[PDB]
Amino acid sequence: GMSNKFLGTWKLVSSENFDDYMKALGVGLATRKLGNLAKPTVINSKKGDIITIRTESTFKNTEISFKLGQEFEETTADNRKTKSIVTLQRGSLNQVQRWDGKETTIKRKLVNGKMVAECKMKGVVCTRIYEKV
Numbered sequence: 516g517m518s519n520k521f522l523g524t525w526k527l528v529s530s531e532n533f534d535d536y537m538k539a540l541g542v543g544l545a546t547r548k549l550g551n552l553a554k555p556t557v558i559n560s561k562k563g564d565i566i567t568i569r570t571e572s573t574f575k576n577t578e579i580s581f582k583l584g585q586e587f588e589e590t591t592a593d594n595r596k597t598k599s600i601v602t603l604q605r606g607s608l609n610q611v612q613r614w615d616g617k618e619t620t621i622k623r624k625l626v627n628g629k630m631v632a633e634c635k636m637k638g639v640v641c642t643r644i645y646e647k648v
């Protein structure tokens with residue numbers, strides 16, 4: 516199952532290519548400007564088989580709760596209404612979001628104690644690195 520090392524509170528320390536990733540998602544300029552300035556805290560928790568990923572920032576907060584492999588309805592930070600599924604693949608927690616015939620993937624994995632999120636949309640790849648606590 517998912518490693519308990521995922522669980523806890525994480526702080527963004529690095530973000531690479533987020534602007535072009537947001538452009539690929541259709542996010543407008545003013546929103547992208549604030550999105551690029553955000554340094555969110557991500558809190559991963561688990562209760563039973565239900566996993567929760569909560570994101571907190573001054574600009575926007577989000578929260579998703581899910582069981583592995585079961586599709587759920589998600590509202591994203593940029594207010595897309597997606598159908599999403601999270602799977603586990605070689606220690607990588609992989610989230611796929613589908614809406615309006617499009618899809619994007621967010622793959623979260625642990626690397627030397629950091630959480631690395633790789634966000635992909637239409638060949639555009641963004642990497643965000645988080646530190647524990």
Ligand SMILES: CCCCCC/C=C\CCCCCCCCCC(=O)O
Pocket residue numbers: 537540542546547549550551553555557570571572574575576591592593621632634643
């Ligand atoms: C907290 C989310 C980012 C900052 C606030 C929202 C800013 C722009 C909305 C554009 C969509 C953001 C997609 C979220 C990708 C998060 C990937 C990650 O967890 O590192």
